[PDB]
Design an enzyme around this catalytic site. Structure first.
Site, PDB file in Angstrom:
ATOM      1  N   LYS B  52      41.406  36.574  37.729  1.00 51.74           N
ATOM      2  CA  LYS B  52      40.861  36.525  39.081  1.00 51.74           C
ATOM      3  C   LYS B  52      40.577  35.089  39.504  1.00 51.74           C
ATOM      4  CE  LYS B  52      38.715  41.136  39.237  1.00 51.74           C
ATOM      5  NZ  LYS B  52      39.225  41.700  37.958  1.00 51.74           N
ATOM      6  N   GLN B  96      32.402  42.580  37.327  1.00 54.38           N
ATOM      7  CA  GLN B  96      33.512  42.983  36.474  1.00 54.38           C
ATOM      8  C   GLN B  96      33.145  44.225  35.671  1.00 54.38           C
ATOM      9  OE1 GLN B  96      36.713  41.574  36.200  1.00 54.38           O
ATOM     10  NE2 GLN B  96      37.101  43.411  34.968  1.00 54.38           N
ATOM     11  N   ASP B 119      34.614  44.684  46.749  1.00 50.81           N
ATOM     12  CA  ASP B 119      35.204  45.827  46.066  1.00 50.81           C
ATOM     13  C   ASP B 119      35.073  47.122  46.857  1.00 50.81           C
ATOM     14  OD1 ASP B 119      36.700  45.476  43.759  1.00 50.81           O
ATOM     15  OD2 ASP B 119      34.939  45.163  42.485  1.00 50.81           O
TER      16      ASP B 119
END
Ligand SMILES: [Cl-]
Ligand SMILES: [K+]
Lengths: 282, 282
Positions: B52, B96, B119
């Site tokens: 990422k 994460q 997200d």
């Protein structure tokens, strides 16, 4: 064997249970109170508000009905909800739909404090349900269906369920609750190519299309469970649902009549969500 | 005439678009920034976070990596999220997954302020999507599939879609986006009695069940569109998806390869949601 899903009898029992709960709550200084906001003089909407107010009185819930003019501004409606949001004596806030064209439905429903959103339409209450968290406020119509199925011990996991209609009021939360219960869900709507392709395989069918005789015996397998959410008035005066009841019931193991099925369960869950909101404030 | 849904190629084109957007945003004093919280020492999570941060550097996004101890308390993690919530220089906050067993994921994700929830896992952003609104953030994996299908000009209106798996990460937001796009959706999972009954009639299949060779050629009709979200590592180390690619691709008009399909599109949407949040500052 075919069994009617008598939502009318179950709703009356739930009202009797809430009346007893409210007597205990009232004795401890808590009077369950629902605020209903009706914008306009629509004849049907006025009937729905009288039904809610009459049902509130039958189980000891204090009703506050606000009949507002059709020409009221969006800011005036927001001001009323803001006052109700901070009224500690008010536990539920319900806005009767539909609203006039000059008032945004999404903005009004999101302005209701989520802790008094007995209709379960606030975005965060929709999100809670979609995350599998059935702790918050659930929409009354699909919740009533679930409570009616549970009253007959209908096991839902593994069942092939078909939902006809994808509205925020019924269809989408209905499919989510069934999915949370472990069922396989198919959501059909007006853009579905072949509706009978799905209904012919289904163990459970929930029809919320608003169309007389949408579901026929041709599209049904033996032993299906049929839940009829439609409330349609024939021009002969008779009230009917979205299902060809006379023929579909001959192939059904369980089926909701109309009237006397989903209708009363929707109102009962509104009262239940209201008492739930008041009971969570001790 | 099978066509590969080249998510790797589309992802590289998106990163080139974001590179130009960030050059414009930087000229207006906006440096797009993504904060990534890594809890513990899971070797796979470390690799994903590095991937990422590398993808952020490629398209001009400033990456902040917070590496916390595996034994961090829940309130300590919440304190960091609160700090990042009020950091105006941070536009996106990602946690994460997976978190340690002693950390409640749902409570952690809800504490992220929804205007930085890249997200799309916050309940109110889940609610916005389920209500049919695009005002919030959308989960990266299903959003990437939609963008991948859109790039290939695949019409979804009226299509019979089947989603295998009903997670909050993929399956549930995917079905909602497909439903919002006008498709008929069926959500299957481990409790479905017969997956083949649904897949053999499907025009489009999204497989996200974490199982090698779950989708076979005989569960599929000719001309199907197959999207493989699975990322499974065999005993030999070879990475494969949930679809038997060699056989299913022979009957598919469009199919995502694994690797190089949904994977890179998931990261591209994370970067795109972060630039979207930074653009809101303009
Ligand atoms: Cl008025
Ligand atoms: K229809």
């Amino acid at each position: 064997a075919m069994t009617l899903l008598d939502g009318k009898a179950l709703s009356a029992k739930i009202k009797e249970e809430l009346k007893e709960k409210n007597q205990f709550l009232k004795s401890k200084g808590i009077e369950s109170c629902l605020a209903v906001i009706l914008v306009g003089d629509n004849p049907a909407s006025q009937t729905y508000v009288k039904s809610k107010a009459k049902a509130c009185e039958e189980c000891g819930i204090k009703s506050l009905v606000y009949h507002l003019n059709e020409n009221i501004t969006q800011n005036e409606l927001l001001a009323l909800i803001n006052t109700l949001n901070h009224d500690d004596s008010v536990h539920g806030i319900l806005v009767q739909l539909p609203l006039p064209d000059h008032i945004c439905k999404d903005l009004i429903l999101e302005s209701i404090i989520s802790s008094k959103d007995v209709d379960g339409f606030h975005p965060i209450n929709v999100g809670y349900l979609n995350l599998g968290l059935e702790s918050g406020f659930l929409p009354c119509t699909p919740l009533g269906v679930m409570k009616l199925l549970k009253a007959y011990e209908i096991d839902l996991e593994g069942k092939d369920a078909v939902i006809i209609g994808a509205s925020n009021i019924v269809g989408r939360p209905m499919a989510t609750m069934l999915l949370n219960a472990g069922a396989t869900v198919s959501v059909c709507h007006i853009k579905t190519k072949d509706l009978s392709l799905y209904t012919r395989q289904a163990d459970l069918i929930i029809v919320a299309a608003g169309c007389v005789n949408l579901l026929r015996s041709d599209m049904v397998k033996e032993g299906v469970i049929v839940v009829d959410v439609g409330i349609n008035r024939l021009e002969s005066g008779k009230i009917v649902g979205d299902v060809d009841f006379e023929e579909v019931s001959k192939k059904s193991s369980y089926i909701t009549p109309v009237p006397g099925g989903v209708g009363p369960m929707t109102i009962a869950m509104l009262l239940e969500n209201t008492v739930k909101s008041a009971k969570n404030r001790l």
